[PDB]
């Protein structure tokens, strides 16, 4: 690995991955005896314990290309179970800010990364691990958190998401938009990793405002449910 | 109005078990209370009756995405909105035995044709079944103590273009079996607002040509599984 | 060993008239001498008999390219090598009336899974019928004084996505009708070495007849096709 | 006004025999009665004269789809509506001999720029000749006792990329020869409403005397002219 | 070679390539003791001297498939440096007829020729030789000629270039449209040839209200040819 | 902007963009009175002066999607001139570690990002600003730095770059591989920004360097880039 310079043995088999380095640092305060095992290229990785289990929290940056590199290197250091915890923009009006979306599949446009890894443009089913996803639903229900289960569209161009865009994807059965799930699910299917994803709704493209104190609380509550699942 | 499924108003139930083979539609109809044949046009047999006191239908969809799309579209026009496909499949991994079941979590497919016509472009839309309904099937099958696996399948359009290279390609991509209608079922359902799921009976194993099963043992498997599916549709 | 068409080898003729509707296969079998039902599996009815001093079979192919591909492949494994599809179609031009016929000279299609799986890439391989066989059809229909038009058709994969925008698009591309199996039939036949053709009965005009007038049209056309198959 | 074919309106016939080589256009013009050179701009030689009671033109189209598309479009703007391409080709099957003829029934092609610009998407529109006109060609060649074969051809865009793997791929796809302009001719004609067809002279066999070739080219040209005026 | 029938040593290493054979013959008058080395299939090729340097002027016809054949055969005959000198239609209103465009890259729709040569649909960078292109800039500025530097769209369908077409390509950074540059640049990068292109603006699709006469245009072609030949013999 | 939380006026019109946050911090020491104007999501942005001009040094992360977001937001805050200074893997054996590559174009695989922005799969010419690129060549020559001018392939999958890969792209006129140039150039053409790129060779995929020799290389090239940006 040339991006994540963590020593083997410093990365856990169970990893909670987030796009924002700031979130990784904030969430590391939920672990027992957290240690920073990497900061190279801004990809902060922390390792500690939770519920009698060793767990790491890693930063993946923005986009498929970035998360693909991070996952490949974490896997080379020992990781094989990944739960992405990010933020997303809702594509339907009934979902409120601060609520959660447990992902069951990812839509995506063919090309680049997918062509290079798959060798052709076939539409491979981009889905998370069945069991791990059901465990997430169980954990979020236990903590009485408001969630929705559905597919999301993994976009590669944040600034090309206009109004035509929103009705198009919502009409295709997607309830939110983000940028890394399709890459995570497909690469995991190919590499044999167990992955899942939970997202915090930070905006609604179909429809409200969220402070930041209510948002930080949302992030924190969801993180605890994710860690519960990872260490089950 | 429908031009293939010639049924009248109120004859088609909201919940439907769809199968590809008309022979299987007829055989499974014997599991219902007072089965009535509501359609036979173009060979697409459809039966309507009761199971556990609930009204339900069993419909034939023929082979391939173009065929099942027409049948789903017309059944929906007749009032159907919940579909559980119950078919057969060829396993793509060595550890799955004949007669066992696969509860589908998603479908891989090659772009083009039907999808381009419905989606208007070549984006890879997530082709997945209804989350809740799929979990209900898992519960139902484990209750009847039936051996099943949960995973993705590849929905092929060319039965006779499935060679060895084919098997390693799709199995390496997270698919554990191959059939021909799930991708169309799931995608059209997501776009139309229908609730769908799929359970398949393993009738062959492309990764293990040495194993075989008789129609007696297979028919037995089909029957046991049909009960589990019907329990779910009427839950 | 075929898993859809369970007819015993020798029970399928080298010459086959294929139709999508099982009901039509049953009805047309009455045009053969000493007709025998050689297959019923999966609803794919297949009858074999004689006509004009030759053995001939009438087979059901179902709806769509994936369905007809399977049927053609298995009939061929059983000895068939000449296929003439007889179906129904919706005209894309206003001057063609219901009940008239269309002898197909080529098929337009959208790039898709079936063609990619068989061709291995996205090349637009010419999807055309056998030239000689197609001319024989023209001769047979002309002999029976039947009104027909020759031209290309679009083989759609999605019946319920054919809107008005659809009609202008394909008619401006040189197609005079729409159906769902010709492209698959023609392309597979060229790759496999089979001799194939197609005649269609216009049952609807998307740009502009009693069940008794239609039924007569179907029957009259079937006779022309059988004459061709045994010419 | 057309910017490549500078012929005056009336100087181009409704019936046109099109060839890729300007040298062939010139040579074949001697088969016409009272031939007149109506254009030479950009090297696209066009002659117009008479044959069997009808006015007929012989036009040069250059090499490749982009070139023939431009020539056909401008000839049409000048009054042409029936086109028969007469070219040379390389057989893809060993049983066809040099100097023999191939009457084209369809053209295979790779999806590409020209087709996308004209069709607006990647659909594989049937690239076929006019059925009636093609049958007339068969009749003319048969009457002159010439040896021909009917079949599909692959319209290649890259002459120098046709390796051995190439021969196997296209021959197994139902094509009996390779050339470069038929797909463009057929598809554009179907969209524009023109009546077109093609006859080819086999100048090489990729699977297996110039005095005999000249004879073959001339004999075929007469059969094509008979067809255009039939 | 089966199209360009020249013998060993008759084709120069440096070649000025043009689409119109009429232009090839006309420009040959700028050479010392020009000799016609080929006329087969209409592809006129002349070889002579400029500034005491041996060079050739060759015809390539219209379109990617045509220029590919010509370049491949000229290269088989010994050519390795190509400078295309043709005509083009501007896609922006501020460019006047008779002015010049020095090409920095070519946009194109995938398929056909590119798929056959590249074996897939990757968008390979279609650009000219860096050094040669800068030589042309120096030469044109030296002869005080008005020119613009930018990318062009290499179209395959002349009669499918409507107005929507103009806004689409101009919004993508292309200032003109022609039909051979993408093929020239890509094939050169793959084959190892040194190539570049200068185009004379003969029309403006963004401004249909401007025109030029064959007199003023011929003068434009001539002046530009001198600058190109100066570069080819530098 | 929701990623780069800097106020308009804190981002310069001239920007030197790098992928590594650490490089941005290191290179900021070359500016006069550097100020950190953003750190959100890890995208460090510094703004200071150099040769009488105001300039910013911004972090863009890894990949097309990431740099596209950063460029769009920097532009919304006033930026219109961008010079990417990154690292790259050489695809040809004659280029040594620590040497530089001035980019003249970028090859790429269609799909995703490009389809969303361009609305189709056309291969738009992904090239830098002609003038700005020539200014870079002049600056590197002046500082007697060893450089090569050529095209690069912008890959989206770092871990799919095998041996077959190297020969393929090298045979297509590309002398190095990186991941952001195609996005930078194409988006710049569409948005009307002036962009260019210089890369430090950190690996050679066709054919070693410590780190001190490398840091020296990065530093020397950064000064040449800043000279170009402020000319
Ligand atoms: N494309 C997209 N990504 C979003 C949105 N909201 C949050 N994200 C996530 O946050 C980052 C971009 O802001 C990416 O890592 C995305 O996964 C949104 O509305 N659109
Ligand atoms: N392509 C394919 N379809 C299968 C297989 N086994 C069962 N099927 C199903 O059965 C029919 C074809 O035999 C289709 O309706 C398929 O869904 C198999 O191995 N391959
Ligand atoms: N897509 C389509 N198929 C048609 C039409 N009319 C008849 N068919 C044929 O009939 C069946 C569907 O009704 C298919 O097997 C088609 O070949 C039509 O208007 N559209
Ligand atoms: N691609 C190709 N074109 C050929 C061949 N033989 C003749 N041609 C024709 O001749 C010209 C190229 O020599 C083009 O106009 C083609 O139509 C061949 O073997 N391959
Ligand atoms: N497609 C196109 N080619 C042009 C234009 N102006 C000049 N050409 C060139 O001239 C020929 C076609 O007229 C081709 O060789 C082109 O390179 C134009 O506006 N559009
Ligand atoms: N794909 C790729 N990117 C590289 C390489 N060397 C450096 N990079 C750059 O460094 C990051 C990935 O290591 C991306 O931002 C690339 O632009 C290489 O060999 N391959």
DSSP secondary structure, chain F, as one string: --S--PPTTSS-SEEEEES-HHHHHHHHTTSEEEEEEE-GGG--EEEEEETTEEEEEEE--SSHHHHHHHHHHHHHTT--EEEEEEEEEESSTTPPTT-EEEEEEEEB--BHHHHHHHSS--B------HHHHHHHHHHHHHTT--EEEEEEEE-S-GGG--HHHHHHHHTTTEEEEESSHHHHHHHHHHHT-EEEEEEEEEEES-----SHHHHHHHHHHHHHHHHHHT-
- Chains within contact range of chain A (3+ C-beta pairs < 8 Å): B, F
**Cβ proximity of A190 and F160 under 8 Å:** no
Supply the Cα-derived Rg of chain F in whole angstroms: 17
A123/B110 Cβ within 8 A: yes
* Structure-derived torsion over alpha carbons of residues E212, E216, E219, E223, reported in degrees to the nearest 10: -60
A113/F157 Cβ within 8 A: yes
Ligand 4 pocket mutation pick from D104, D179, D200 by most atoms within 8 angstroms of CB: D179
* Minimum Cα–Cα distance from E152: chain F residue: F125
List Cβ neighbours of E101 (8 Å cut-off, separation of 6 or more).
E88, E90, E95, E147, E148, E149, E150, E152, E175, E176, E198, E199, E201
Q: Is the CB of B203 under 6 A from ligand 2?
A: yes
Closest-CA residue, ligand 3 atom 19, reads: C90
Nearest to C111 among D108, D124, D135 (CB): D124
Contacts of E110 in chain D (CB under 8 A): 112-113
Q: CATH code at C74? A: 3.40.50.1580
Ligand nearest to the CA of C158: 3
- In sequence order, the β-bridge partners of residue F191 are none
C151/D131 Cβ within 8 A: yes
List Cβ neighbours of C210 (8 Å cut-off, separation of 6 or more).
none
Q: What is the rounded CA–CA span in Å between residue D39 and residue D8?
A: 9
**Cβ proximity of D129 and D195 under 8 Å:** no
Maximum distance among all Cα pairs of chain D, rounded to whole angstroms: 48
Q: Is the dihedral of CA D135, D137, D140, D145 positive or negative?
A: negative
Nearest to E155 among D4, D43, D117 (CB): D117
Contacts of C4 in chain B (CB under 8 A): 63
B111/A123 Cβ within 8 A: yes
Q: Is the CB of F48 under 6 A from ligand 6?
A: no
List Cβ neighbours of B120 (8 Å cut-off, separation of 6 or more).
none
* Minimum Cα–Cα distance from C171: chain D residue: D191
d(CA E64, nearest CA chain D) in Å = 8
Q: Is the CB of D177 under 6 A from ligand 4?
A: no
Contacts of F131 in chain E (CB under 8 A): 149
Atom of ligand 5 nearest to the CA of E180: 17
Taking CA atoms, F102 is separated from A36, C173, E106, F63, F146, in Å, by 37, 48, 19, 19, 10
Atom of ligand 6 nearest to the CA of F158: 1
Q: Is the dihedral of CA B144, B145, B148, B150 positive or negative?
A: positive
F10-32 burial: b if 16+ Cβ within 10 Å, else e: bbbbbbbbbbbbebbbbbbebbe
Tell whether A202 is in a known binding site: yes
Nearest to D63 among E19, E21, E65 (CB): E65
Q: Is the CB of D156 under 6 A from ligand 4?
A: yes
Pairing verdict, β E53-59 and E45-50: antiparallel
**Cβ proximity of F197 and F184 under 8 Å:** yes
Tell whether A178 is in a known binding site: yes
Q: What is the rounded CA–CA span in Å between residue E94 and residue F182?
A: 28
B106/A125 Cβ within 8 A: yes
DSSP state of C207: T
d(CA F150, nearest CA chain E) in Å = 8
DSSP 3-state of B138: helix
Ligand nearest to the CA of F160: 6
Q: Is the CB of F184 under 6 A from ligand 6?
A: no
A131-143 burial: b if 16+ Cβ within 10 Å, else e: ebbbbbbebbeee
Q: Is the CB of B88 under 6 A from ligand 2?
A: yes
Q: What is the rounded CA–CA span in Å between residue F46 and residue F59?
A: 9
| Cα angle: A125, vertex A130, A133; to 5 degrees | 110
DSSP state of E96: P
Q: Provide the resolution (angstroms).
A: 1.8
Locus of tokens 């930026």:
F79
Tell whether D218 is in a known binding site: no
Nearest to D173 among C111, C174, C190 (CB): C190
List Cβ neighbours of C182 (8 Å cut-off, separation of 6 or more).
C85, C104, C107, C127, C153, C155, C198
Give me the number of domains chain F comprises.
1
User: Phi and psi for C80 in degrees, rounded to 5?
Assistant: -75, 140
Tokens at residue D24, please? 């062939």
Taking CA atoms, D145 is separated from D100, D132, D133, D220, E130, in Å, by 11, 20, 19, 11, 59
Count how many pairs of residues, chain D against chain E, have C-beta atoms within 8 Å: 127
For residue C18, the CA-to-ligand 2 centroid distance in Å is 22
Q: What is the rounded CA–CA span in Å between residue E206 and residue A119?
A: 41
Which has the closest alpha carbon to A125: B196, F157, B153, B206? B153
Q: What is the rounded CA–CA span in Å between residue A155 and residue A17?
A: 18
Count how many pairs of residues, chain A against chain F, have C-beta atoms within 8 Å: 127
Atom of ligand 3 nearest to the CA of C180: 17
Atom of ligand 4 nearest to the CA of D180: 17
Q: What is the rounded CA–CA span in Å between residue E51 and residue E234?
A: 9
Q: Using CB atoms within 10 A of its CB, is residue E192 exposed (0-12), middle (13-18) or buried (19+)?
A: exposed
C152/D119 Cβ within 8 A: no
A151/B128 Cβ within 8 A: yes
Taking CA atoms, D118 is separated from C17, C221, D66, D78, D113, in Å, by 37, 37, 11, 21, 9
Closest-CA residue, ligand 3 atom 9, reads: C179
For residue C63, the CA-to-ligand 3 centroid distance in Å is 8
Q: Is the CB of F88 under 6 A from ligand 6?
A: yes
Chains E and B, touching by 3 or more CB pairs within 8 angstroms: no
Q: Is the CB of C60 under 6 A from ligand 3?
A: no
B215-233 helix and B131-143 helix, angle to the nearest 10 degrees: 130
| Residues after which a C–N gap over 2.5 Å breaks chain A | 207
| Residues after which a C–N gap over 2.5 Å breaks chain D | 208
List the domain range (segments joined by +) for residue C123.
1-231
For residue D206, the CA-to-ligand 4 centroid distance in Å is 12
* Minimum Cα–Cα distance from E102: chain F residue: F130
Tell whether D226 is in a known binding site: no
Nearest to D190 among C109, C123, C173 (CB): C173
Nearest to F173 among E134, E172, E190 (CB): E190
The residue of E113, E168, E212, E217 whose CB has the most chain D CBs within 10 angstroms, and thus the best one to mutate to test that interface, is E113
Contacts of B179 in chain C (CB under 8 A): none
The residue of B71, B113, B204 whose CB has the most chain C CBs within 10 angstroms, and thus the best one to mutate to test that interface, is B113
For residue D155, the CA-to-ligand 4 centroid distance in Å is 9
């Amino acid at each position: 690995p040339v991006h994540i310079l963590a020593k083997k043995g410093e990365v856990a088999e169970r990893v909670l991955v987030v796009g924002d380095p700031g979130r990784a640092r904030l969430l590391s305060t939920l672990l027992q005896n957290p240690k920073l095992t990497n900061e190279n290229r801004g990809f902060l990785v922390y390792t500690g314990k939770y519920n009698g289990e060793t767990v790491s929290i890693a930063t993946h940056g923005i986009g498929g290309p970035s998360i693909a590199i991070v996952l490949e290197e974490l896997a080379m250091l020992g990781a094989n179970v990944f739960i992405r915890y990010g933020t997303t923009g809702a594509l339907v009006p009934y979902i409120n800010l601060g609520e959660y979306i447990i992902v069951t599949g990812a839509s995506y446009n063919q090309g680049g990364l997918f062509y290079q890894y798959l060798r052709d443009n076939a539409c491979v089913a981009s889905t998370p691990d069945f069991e791990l996803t059901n465990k997430l639903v169980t954990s979020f229900s236990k903590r009485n958190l408001k969630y929705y289960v559905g597919n999301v569209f993994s976009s590669d161009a944040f600034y090309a998401e206009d109004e035509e865009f929103v009705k198009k994807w919502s009409s295709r059965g997607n309830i939110a938009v983000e940028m890394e799930c399709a890459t995570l699910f497909t690469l995991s299917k190919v590499k044999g990793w167990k992955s899942a994803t939970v997202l915090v709704v930070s905006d609604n493209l179909a429809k409200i405002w969220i402070t930041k104190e209510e948002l930080e609380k949302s992030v924190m509550d969801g993180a605890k449910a994710v860690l519960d699942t990872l260490t089950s």
